Design a protein around this ligand. Structure first.
Ligand SMILES: CO[C@@H]1O[C@H](CS[C@@H]2O[C@H](CO)[C@@H](O)[C@H](O)[C@H]2O)[C@@H](O)[C@H](O)[C@H]1O
Ligand SMILES: *[C@@H]1O[C@H](CO)[C@@H](O)[C@H](O)[C@H]1NC(C)=O
Length: 606
């Protein structure tokens, strides 16, 4: 279609499938294996990217150009890598991926939304869609085109260190929250075929349904571990939301470290090829988890030749290496040259990778848009995060007896009030894991509003606000306080490291609640990624709120505490009486919850 030097794959007016086929037909084996290779920015240079025809880069958790980097620094980094990829013979742009799992959370100054468990508490799929839309803008503000989200794990045991990344133990709620996908990617057209990938263009991002499949079912919540359950339970609990993801055009699917009945997912041809590709008709690309293929063997990495063979024959398309790219490429090249992996498998993987890249407009807009930089931390997005945080709050108690005056909502005008606890003025703790660092961090790690700052911003100007992190009983009784707000809970974790199977919050937490509540009426705000042992906190408190991990916008908490809005959140998970009961799920047999799934007290706006 028209100039003597015309190349069909470079023609933006041509159908995606025609462009894929035209490009594929021109590629060398090295070019094909390159597309299947995703590497860490930490190991990338221009020469590496050109010489190995690299298909993708990522930032893993905490992988950033520097601490405090601006949106433009991120754009310049991504564009620098892209320039190298565009300089190859065929000029195939790379796709850059990142865990933007509650906002663009590795980035300083990005809006941090509540984690998934709290979003589950909202029962508001349209809210989650809007969060997807805002997140895509903040990811594109940094030049990145691909988010490793949503996590559609159905966490069946809160001992799992990633339980906060699951919307619910109830697959129906997880299914409902797949609305994140068309938020991130754009709504699919009216005549859309389920399983086809979709991204609307340069203001949206490719999404990733993860981690396929049964990551939320690992025995004792182990992680990296074994999901022991028959096909009926896999198909009834863990699989359904993958079908909703297909219907919404999710562009990619990431495979789980976990096993299903002792078969590693990264080596499971029946599920990856037989089910996801051949039954669900998924036509996007399947990506490994981080050194996921290495972990097929015991010990991990002990037979990388086997890892490559097993994963690629199972049907994975792109490998998150992410560091030892030379070894990966060499081994895969050897397997193809030896006939161990047929060219048909390589061509399928590359077809899928290219399909996503062409579909999403990456060949037309390979570079960042500087005008998008100002989307990062944009106040409208913070207002949305604040709405989400407020909707996520579950009121568990509002009065010690049925005849007490309800403590919440609190009056904004009072002579003197106390704000206390380890979590009252700690932005990192209120964001939890996957914020700035992989495992999160403590203190003022980004731009946000702590609970204490929210309180000071909400109250009447005549209200004196006193902060004490861990006041003793005497301090409270002598202070002349009208009431106290005390915030405690879990520290940030991902159970790569965090950990504690006992699910009790660290001290001082309970001791502070007891000292405070013993002296003045108190509203306890519990910051957690999951249900934790709560009877002693309840016993001490007049009112108690499960605030989950509400993110950067602490005013969502105070919007409910002071009655600007009523409490509406409902538990998206069972609250156990003790950890001895676990696993214990709405439906079991020994189902004896402290609070059932769906529980939540309400208030009316004042
Ligand atoms: C401890 O090593 C660190 O692990 C994390 C998480 S592993 C894996 O990472 C993927 C890419 O970031 C995530 O999409 C996926 O959900 C995770 O299971 C990794 O992010 C760090 O890069 C790595 O240092
Ligand atoms: C809240 O709203 C409903 C009626 O709309 C009712 O349960 C309750 O009496 C109202 N007010 C308060 C303070 O609970």
């Amino acid at each position: 279609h028209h100039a003597a030097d015309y190349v069909l794959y470079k023609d933006a007016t041509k159908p995606v499938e025609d462009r894929v086929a035209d490009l594929l037909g021109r590629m060398t084996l090295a070019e094909k294996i390159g597309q299947m290779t995703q590497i860490e920015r930490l190991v990338a240079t221009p020469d590496v990217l050109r010489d190995n025809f690299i298909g993708s880069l990522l930032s893993g958790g905490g992988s950033v150009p520097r601490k405090g980097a601006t949106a433009k620094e991120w754009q310049d980094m991504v564009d620098g890598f892209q320039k190298a990829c565009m300089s190859t013979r065929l000029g195939i742009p790379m796709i850059y991926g990142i865990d933007a799992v509650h906002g663009q959370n590795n980035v300083y100054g990005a809006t941090i939304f509540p984690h998934n468990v709290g979003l589950g508490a909202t029962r508001d799929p349209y809210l989650v869609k809007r969060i997807g839309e805002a997140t895509a803008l903040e990811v594109r503000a940094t030049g990145i085109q691909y988010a490793f989200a949503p996590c559609i794990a159905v966490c069946r045991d809160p001992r799992w260190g990633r339980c906060y990344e699951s919307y619910s133990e109830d697959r129906r709620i997880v299914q409902s929250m797949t609305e994140l996908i068309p938020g991130l990617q754009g709504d699919v057209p009216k005549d859309f075929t389920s399983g086809m990938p979709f991204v609307a263009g340069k203001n949206k991002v490719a999404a990733c349904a993860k981690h396929f499949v049964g990551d939320g079912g690992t025995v004792d919540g182990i992680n990296e571990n074994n999901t022991i359950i028959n096909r009926e339970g896999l198909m009834n609990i863990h699989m359904p939301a993958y079908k909703n993801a297909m219907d919404k055009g999710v562009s990619t699917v990431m495979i789980s470290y976990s096993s299903w009945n002792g078969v590693k997912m990264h080596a499971n041809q029946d599920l990856v090829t037989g089910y996801l590709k051949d039954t669900l008709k998924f036509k996007g690309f399947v990506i490994s988890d981080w050194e996921g293929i290495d972990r097929i063997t015991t010990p991990a990495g002990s037979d990388y030749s086997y890892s490559v063979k097993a994963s690629i024959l199972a049907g994975l398309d792109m490998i998150m290496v992410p560091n030892k790219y030379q070894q990966f490429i060499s081994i895969l090249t050897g397997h193809v040259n030896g006939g161990v992996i047929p060219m048909s498998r390589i061509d399928d993987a590359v077809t899928r990778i290219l399909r996503v890249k062409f579909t999403m407009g990456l060949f037309e807009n390979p570079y960042a848009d500087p005008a998008m930089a100002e989307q990062l931390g944009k106040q409208e997005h913070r207002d949305l995060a604040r709405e989400a945080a407020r909707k996520s709050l579950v009121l568990l108690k509002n009065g010690k007896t049925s005849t007490d005056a309800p403590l919440l909502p609190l009056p904004k005008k009072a002579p003197k009030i106390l704000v206390a606890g380890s979590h009252a003025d700690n932005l990192g703790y209120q964001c939890g894991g996957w914020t700035i660092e992989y495992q999160g961090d403590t203190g003022r790690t980004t731009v946000g509003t702590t609970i204490l700052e929210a309180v000071k911003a909400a109250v009447d100007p005549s209200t004196v606000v006193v902060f004490a992190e861990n006041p003793d009983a005497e301090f409270v009784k002598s202070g002349g306080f009208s009431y106290a707000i005390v915030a405690v809970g879990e520290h940030p974790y991902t159970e790569t490291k965090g950990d504690n199977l006992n699910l009790t919050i660290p001290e001082p937490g309970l001791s502070t609640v007891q000292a405070v509540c013993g002296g003045v009426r108190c509203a306890t705000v519990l910051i957690s990624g999951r249900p934790v042992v709560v009877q002693p906190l309840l016993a001490a408190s007049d009112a108690l709120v499960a605030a989950w991990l509400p993110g950067s916008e602490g005013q969502g908490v105070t919007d409910a505490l002071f009655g600007d809005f009523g409490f509406t959140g409902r538990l998206p998970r069972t609250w156990f009486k003790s950890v001895d009961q676990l696993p214990m799920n709405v439906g079991d047999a020994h189902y004896d919850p402290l609070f059932r799934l769906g529980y939540g007290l309400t208030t009316n706006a004042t």
